[model samples]
Target: AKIKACVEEVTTTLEETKFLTENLLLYIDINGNLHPDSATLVSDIDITFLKKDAPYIVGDVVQEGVLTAVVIPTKGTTEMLAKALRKVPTDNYITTYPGQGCNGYTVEEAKTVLKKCKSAFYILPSILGTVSWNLREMLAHAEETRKLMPVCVETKAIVSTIQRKYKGIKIQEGVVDYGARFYFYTSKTTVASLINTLNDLNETLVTMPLGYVTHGLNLEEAARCMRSLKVPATVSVSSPDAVTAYNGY
Candidate 1:
């Protein structure tokens, strides 16, 4: 009898209510700024509103309607991106420049002589060392990995070979050729196979594919695929974890 009474009391308080009147054009500033980043894009979002709020949303026709806003910390380049897309309007543009994935555009120009050729193989060591990522193991535990990944120079050699062989390939304004996309990623074993492949391909004079390697320090892998036909590449670094506690190192 006591249990039945409790159930009745709970049921009595539970009532179903539905609102299909009011609507809103909801914009979420993913980065919490009035502006968004270069890579940031708008996508569909889910919302909940009552019928009393519907007319107000469709056209602001519900004169009494007012907008409620929220701001939150975000991912991606917030401040740097805000500078690039400052003109774009949004009550809250979802800026992300303050944190990771933040960056700005820097226009540049250079001059160099070149030659031409036919089908060729392109080798890019930086693809692994700099662009695609830091070493795979390091990336797996980006916070803990103490040692940085090794630098690879093969990418430069590949690009040089391609440029020397193909006359049309030129790094003019945006990118050099735009004929291909540099796909890069990291795996434990693949790195070794890749190095071996590059060596075997170049062992003879038959001229293996054009090899392109950027000669420089080690780089984080995420920056690899961003390179262009102009042969530009990017990289990043991480600070190793200093202390290990009761959880174990």
Candidate 2:
């Protein structure tokens, strides 16, 4: 765990390395032309990255990836967050600083990291960010994409919690669909909870949002309340529920 903690810590090195991998795509017109304003007003952009779903037009060409990490600048404390962006092919959401959207790390610092990672498009950071005045914009995307599960105790620590709890799994993954939920971690430990119940239900995790489940779902839809948000597990079910559970070969 010492090695794990080293890279995962909120120290300058961890911050620096990940900052290198941060990406930003310039705004592009429908015909593949870089938006002049993107270049003109980038320095003025207060957030770390603009989300593809935001009320702006991002190049569909460049918008090719899943939104795996959705860090709430309002809450990602590194300790509460679960995993770091290593090699999972997906986009991110952050604020300008640790306390705001793209909040954990500075957007300027991420630029240096992007440059160090040799990512060419220093255009606009490919991250979605939020603001105190426009918090709704952030929440809108979260709900639309079914990314947030506010019912969990660590409501704001969703990104990190998911990474740590699910053995480095990202909520959004793959070029097509969210991939099979079970496929993310056929092997791992720790938060080995709700996945079983989900598997028994033959559920596609990405198809539904945790927010939808907890805030207003019908009975027996999820596991009982918890000190933190744990996925459904070990619950009473009707006859002939899950087909198989015995892995004791």
- Which model scores highest in TM-score? 1
Predicted structure 1, TM vs. truth: 0.19
Which residues of candidate 1, in runs, are more than 4 Å off? 1-94, 102-156, 178-217, 221-249
lDDT of 1 at 51: 26
> For residues 121-156, what per-residue lDDT tens digits would candidate 2 score against the true structure?
213222122112122333343335544222233334
Candidate 2 — worst ten consecutive residues by lDDT sum? Answer: 240-249
The positional error of residue 121 in candidate 1, measured at the CA in angstroms, is: 49
CA lDDT of each candidate? 0.23, 0.28
Backbone clashes for every candidate come to: 54, 19
lDDT of 1 by residue, 1-249 (tens): 111111000111101100211222122233222112211122232223222343221112111132222221222333433332222222211111122211112211000000011111111111223222333332333324322212232345444644454446553222122233222222322332333332333321111111212322123222221221122112333322211110111
